[PDB]
Amino acid sequence: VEWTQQERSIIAGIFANLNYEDIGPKALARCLIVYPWTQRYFGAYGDLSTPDAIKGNAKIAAHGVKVLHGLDRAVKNMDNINEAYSELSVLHSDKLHVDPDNFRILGDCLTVVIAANLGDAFTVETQCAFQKFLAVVVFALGRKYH
Amino acid sequence: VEWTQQERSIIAGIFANLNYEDIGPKALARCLIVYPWTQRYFGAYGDLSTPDAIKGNAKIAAHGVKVLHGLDRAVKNMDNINEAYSELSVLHSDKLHVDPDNFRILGDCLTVVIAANLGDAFTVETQCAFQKFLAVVVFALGRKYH
Amino acid sequence: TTLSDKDKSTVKALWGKISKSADAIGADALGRMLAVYPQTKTYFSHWPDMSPGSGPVKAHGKKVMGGVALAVSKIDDLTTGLGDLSELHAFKMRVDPSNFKILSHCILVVVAKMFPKEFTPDAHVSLDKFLASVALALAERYR
Amino acid sequence: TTLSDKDKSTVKALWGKISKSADAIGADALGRMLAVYPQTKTYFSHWPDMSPGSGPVKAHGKKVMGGVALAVSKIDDLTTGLGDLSELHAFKMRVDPSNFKILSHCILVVVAKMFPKEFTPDAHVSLDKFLASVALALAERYR
Ligand code: HEM
Ligand code: HEM
Ligand code: HEM
Ligand code: HEM
Secondary structure: OOHHHHHHHHHHHHHHHOOOOHHHHHHHHHHHHHHHHHHHHHHHHHOOOOOOHOOOHHHHHHHHHHHOOOOHHHOOOOHHHHOOHHHHHHHHHHHOOOOOHHHHHHHHHHHHHHHHHHHHHHHHHHHHHHHHHHHHHHHHHHHHOO | OOOOHHHHHHHHHHHOOOOOOHHHHHHHHHHHHHHHHHHHHOOOOOOOOOHHHHHHOOOHHHHHHHHHHOOOOHHHHHOHHHHHHHHHHHHHHHHHOOOOOOOOOOOOHHHHHHHHHHHHHHHHHHHHHHHHHHHHHHHHHHHOOO | OOOOOHHHHHHHHHHHEEEEEEEHHHHHHHHHHHHHOHHHHHOOOOOOOOOOHHHHHHHHHHHHHHHHHHHHHHHOOOHOOOOHHHHHHHHOOOHOOHHHHHHHHHHHHHHHHHOOOOOOOOHHHHHHHHHHHHHHHHHHOOO | OOOOOOHHHHHHHHHHHHHHHHHHHHHHHHHHHHOHHHHHHHHHHOOOOOOOOOOOHHHHHHHHHHHHHHHOOOHHHHHHHHHHHHHHHHHHHHOHHHHHHHHHHHHHHHHHHOOOOOOOHHHHHHHHHHHHHHHHHHOOOOO
């Protein structure tokens, strides 16, 4: 992908003062609630039976933070995201067995969460750049599935 | 993408042997029948009113041939498909207003036509390579929509 | 898939809070659809100004949420309720049904942007279902 | 979307021709789904060998096609007919419904490969609509 300076700056700007402990849990919880099959992977995470339980689940919250911090390496390496995610793709495929369609779905939840959080700051061009960034990351994370 | 020598040989083999005057029309007619919205672009092509009219329509047939030959440059240089299809993508976007999702569905219909044509010779590995090739081409064709 | 009573009453409730801003939701969600997913622009070539907030985007956005409003009134049977709009989409504009999901996602992003506190995960799942049901209803007459 | 009477008699007549090979269609379609779209392998990691024609692949292809057979018999009401199977996919295996479309495409490709004369575009349009109804029926219990 060819990035414009505006795109690189928007992406840096979203992450520079991101509250990961806010946004991360919101994104993953929302995903588990709106697309409940994504709970497949979280049998070891305890109570997921209702929305309230998922939103109060500190183990899922800690995972939301972990997944969100997982975008950090893309932000830092925007021209080399394929290479930066190759090992994480291997992991999600060979060890974790996560259906990569779920990456797309989580990104859509993350978008909704960041939209809610940023308000007026979530301009049309912000959405455009952030969508472009998520598409590249999600593709990257699907590459090593075989 | 990262091609294997086997994928290169298979893709080259499919198009070397192909009767374009047969496969071209069948793939495009099937797409206009199975996905009738794709008919919108062919208002100057005469009778599209029944599956029979469409399969018997010479102008649709000539067009199927032309589209299929449109894969030739990609088969010839599998390493530069984005670049090669630049001008074609611009044509489909700005002049023809073709929804790039239709490229994917024409790709699915083409696969059905080739499978029906090759029978046992359409091996699983043959389908893996053909799909990988259509995915690259469909991506390249959608690249210049802005 | 089929809307439960829970989904229907969740959508009706959310719609009671947000319906006052239907025109603004539509304008914003269509301008976002066009910008963020420029493949969708291919259906709007007759109205070249597709910039956010433009006249044509506002008018077309208002039309779409009008259909969403009607879909809320006809929520018990969208197949019948949206049949005339399905006929229009199938044979006049001939919009590939794939695009309905793109616009639905953009509506959800706008509703979250405008109504962050009301747009809970619970509201979101039921609204997402409702928009999938809308999309399916609109695809009915295509083939 | 709703299957018309034409779709239902089209699918039944085609099923009458291909049903005798249900086991071989299922094996080949599953093996092609796994290999051509390796995203789907994520639901099958319990199996030693996912390669085309392997024991588990044949065994499961047969099960799936039995599901498709049931669907043809329950074609007037796929929602009730596949309710138990939806429940199973929803809560046990929790297959992302996006995979249903993929297998549907693989089944159509294998039908065209095995039955090239019978699989006209007219047969194809109705079977495609039928497998989409199947997919929707399977998704019913997910949320
Ligand atoms: C935005 C997309 C995602 C990113 C960037 C991401 C990133 C990460 C990272 C960095 C880890 C820890 C890796 C390590 O231990 O070295 C992880 C683990 C994991 N992720 Fe993903 N993830 C994403 C989406 C998903 C989704 C959608 C699911 C399933 C719904 C999922 C399920 C898991 C599971 C089950 C683990 C392992 C927990 C453990 O045993 O340590 N991830 N992910
Ligand atoms: C494999 C995907 C496709 C390829 C490789 C392809 C290739 C081509 C080529 C080579 C041309 C002629 C360009 C020229 O003369 O400079 C063309 C024109 C055209 N294509 Fe595509 N095409 C594809 C898919 C589609 C689809 C799916 C549709 C719509 C259903 C479509 C609609 C058209 C139309 C309407 C024209 C103009 C014909 C005319 O002038 O009347 N194409 N395409
Ligand atoms: C939530 C899904 C949608 C709904 C409820 C919807 C509803 C409507 C309604 C009520 C109208 C006006 C009909 C009239 O003149 O009476 C309309 C027009 C139109 N829609 Fe859809 N629409 C949806 C999705 C889409 C999508 C995804 C596209 C394309 C990407 C699209 C393209 C168009 C176009 C081109 C018009 C006609 C513009 C004009 O003649 O002024 N629609 N829609
Ligand atoms: C046409 C769509 C499908 C139909 C009709 C279908 C049908 C069935 C049936 C009848 C069973 C066995 C139920 C029983 O044991 O009583 C089954 C099991 C199963 N299916 Fe589905 N299926 C479909 C799609 C899929 C897809 C897309 C996937 C995954 C990518 C999938 C994954 C599974 C798995 C993992 C099992 C359990 C198999 C085992 O480990 O023994 N199915 N399916």
